[PDB]
Structures are given as structure tokens and as C-alpha cells.
Amino acid sequence: YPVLDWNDIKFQDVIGEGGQVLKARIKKDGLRMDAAIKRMKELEVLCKLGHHPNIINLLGACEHRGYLYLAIEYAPHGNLLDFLRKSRVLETDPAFAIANSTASTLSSQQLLHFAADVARGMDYLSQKQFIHRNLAARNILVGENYVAKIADFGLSRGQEVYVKKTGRLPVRWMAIESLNYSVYTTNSDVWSYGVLLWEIVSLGGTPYCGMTCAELYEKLPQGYRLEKPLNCDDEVYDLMRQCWREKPYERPSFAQILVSLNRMLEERKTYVNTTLYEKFTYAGIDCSA
Ligand SMILES: Nc1ncnc2sc(-c3c(-c4ccccc4)ncn3CC3CCCCC3)nc12
């Protein structure tokens, strides 16, 4: 749904590392478009769903010499985290940075729309009972027209899902119940989303720069939260803080989040500063992460 003919695929380049994925061009319903194709060895109807503008759409699937190749909507601009980081103009093009009084090629409004974008997608998923379990900047793709898209693959669907650990955990993104007990819910997804939001605001900062994974475990039950960024308005931070409430059911819903962003967007006020003025400080990326 649909079905792709092999003879319409023209592969262009490989993308990433390892599973095994490629950039193609497919023909679908008489139109030519970029796809990303992954080839699996040896669930798809629910994969649309993708019909939503912030969810990587499924384009086609196609059996060829014993394999199933899966074509999905192609994202021109990488994961959101890199995109954001490459936007750090003081570091990548300071002549530009100074001339234009700016710390990013991205604007506060644009930064928020990525937030809204993901917020919106999640809202639509969470209300169809899906649990992402991996919300993080690096896990969001920036798609055509710079519209942020979520990945719908391997999504647990249900009220709650327990997964046993053992690979690496996104500790810095996880909420406490997930930390304590390896359980994920939609409410666990919102916690992660606030870290995503925090990530966006820090133009790609590593959350909890300096702290180690051990330190976090001990300090989070303690009531410790990520520090409000120097470029961030108080309400934006406030919103992050709600996502990180200790009591899961206390946190907001994506609708609530989304409502609140949409308000912020409609105001003329800058909620996320990217303008140099007299001082500006990029959240650390390095650290021992
Ligand atoms: N649509 C795309 N356009 C650009 N590049 C890529 S890389 C990619 C991908 C796939 C994949 C899965 C199915 C088909 C094709 C690719 N499996 C892991 N990834 C990498 C992950 C990156 C972070 C967010 C989750 C996906 N999909 C895209």
C-alpha cells in the first residue's frame, strides 16, 4: 500500500551507516519523487498514518529478488539536531554571524515551528495510542520545506509498554519512571519532548552538559531539572518544566503543548533569542556524552 515497481527506482547515493539505506527516485501515481529506500531481509497499512504532514510518509514497498525494499518520504536536510547545529553561525560562518547580528541562520519563529511540528505529530500519534519512546532532536527529520517530520517505525501501541534494557540508553532523554522501571507511556514521551524542546532552544546543545549518566540517576529523583538557557524566554522554559514534572499524569498532553506553542507563535514577541546584542553563549555540544 501502495506497491512499487522495481523499474521505477533509480538509486542515487547511500545515506548513513548501519541498517542499509539509499536515496532513490521513484515513480508513484505517475509522479517522480525522492524516496529513501531500505532493504529488509525476508504493520505497513498502519504506516499511513504517514498521511500526516509531520510523520515521515510511506511511499511504496516492493519485493525484488527475494527482498522487500521499503520506500518512504525523503528528508532533504538530515536529522533535526545536526540541522540545528549547522545553524550555529558564530562557529560555522562568523563573518556572516557578525554582519547579521545573529547566532543562528534559524529564527525564533522557525525554531518554534519545529517544536510545533513535532508537538503536532506526537499529538496525532499519542491519540492513536502510540508510544514513541525515542523522542530526541537527532530522531526527528527535517523534511521538504523545512517541515519537521517524525519516524513512525517500531512504535509500541498501547496504554503502557515495558521494555527490558541491554545497546545504549538515551538516558538524558528518559523520564524517571522510565529510568527506574523501563516503562514508557505517552506521559514518558512528553518528558522526552521537553528535552527535545530544550534541545531546539539551545540550537543543539547536549542536555546535562558535564554531568555523567550516573550523576543524573541520583539527581533527578532529587528534583533536579535542566537549566533554563540564556537565550530562552521564561514561558518556553516553563513549558519544558511541565513536561518534566515528577508525577507523570501531572504532565501536559501534546494538544496542551501544541496549543501553547501556537499562542507563542502568533505573538510578535521573540521567545527564543538568536540575536547577538552584547553577549551570546552556545550551549556546549562536546562534553563527555
Ligand atoms: N526518510 C529519510 N530521508 C532521509 N534520510 C533518512 S535516514 C532514514 C532511516 C531509515 C529508513 C527506514 C526505512 C526506509 C528508509 C530509511 N532507518 C533509519 N533511518 C535513520 C534515522 C534518522 C533519524 C530519524 C529516524 C531515522 N530515513 C530517511
From Swiss-Prot:
Changing R85L: Found in a patient with multiple sporadic venous malformations; increased ligand-independent autophosphorylation. Proteolytic processing leads to the shedding of the extracellular domain (soluble TIE-2 alias sTIE-2). Autophosphorylated on tyrosine residues in response to ligand binding. Autophosphorylation occurs in trans, i.e. one subunit of the dimeric receptor phosphorylates tyrosine residues on the other subunit. Autophosphorylation occurs in a sequential manner, where Tyr-162 in the kinase activation loop is phosphorylated first, followed by autophosphorylation at Tyr-277 and at additional tyrosine residues. ANGPT1-induced phosphorylation is impaired during hypoxia, due to increased expression of ANGPT2. Phosphorylation is important for interaction with GRB14, PIK3R1 and PTPN11. Keywords: Angiogenesis, ATP-binding, Cell junction, Cell membrane, Cytoplasm, Cytoskeleton, Disease variant, Disulfide bond, EGF-like domain, Glaucoma, Glycoprotein, Immunoglobulin domain, Kinase, Membrane, Nucleotide-binding, Phosphoprotein, Receptor, Repeat, Secreted, Signal, Transferase, Transmembrane, Transmembrane helix, Tyrosine-protein kinase, Ubl conjugation. It is found in: Cell membrane; Cell junction; Cell junction, Focal adhesion; Cytoplasm, Cytoskeleton. Detected in umbilical vein endothelial cells. Proteolytic processing gives rise to a soluble extracellular domain that is detected in blood plasma (at protein level). Predominantly expressed in endothelial cells and their progenitors, the angioblasts. Has been directly found in placenta and lung, with a lower level in umbilical vein endothelial cells, brain and kidney. Residues 1-289 are cytoplasmic. One of its GO terms (molecular function) is protein kinase activity. GO terms for cellular component: apical plasma membrane; basal plasma membrane; basolateral plasma membrane; cell surface; cell-cell junction; centrosome; ciliary basal body; cytoplasm. Changing R32W: In VMCM; increased ligand-independent autophosphorylation and kinase activation; no effect on location at membrane. The modification Phosphotyrosine is found at Y162, Y271, Y277. Its main location: membrane. Tyrosine-protein kinase that acts as a cell-surface receptor for ANGPT1, ANGPT2 and ANGPT4 and regulates angiogenesis, endothelial cell survival, proliferation, migration, adhesion and cell spreading, reorganization of the actin cytoskeleton, but also maintenance of vascular quiescence. Has anti-inflammatory effects by preventing the leakage of pro-inflammatory plasma proteins and leukocytes from blood vessels. Required for normal angiogenesis and heart development during embryogenesis. Required for post-natal hematopoiesis. Homodimer. Heterodimer with TIE1. Interacts with ANGPT1, ANGPT2 and ANGPT4. At cell-cell contacts in quiescent cells, forms a signaling complex composed of ANGPT1 plus TEK molecules from two adjoining cells. In the absence of endothelial cell-cell contacts, interaction with ANGPT1 mediates contacts with the extracellular matrix. Interacts with PTPRB; this promotes endothelial cell-cell adhesion. Interacts with DOK2, GRB2, GRB7, GRB14, PIK3R1 and PTPN11/SHP2. Colocalizes with DOK2 at contacts with the extracellular matrix in migrating cells. Interacts (tyrosine phosphorylated) with TNIP2. This is Angiopoietin-1 receptor. It comes from Homo sapiens (Human).
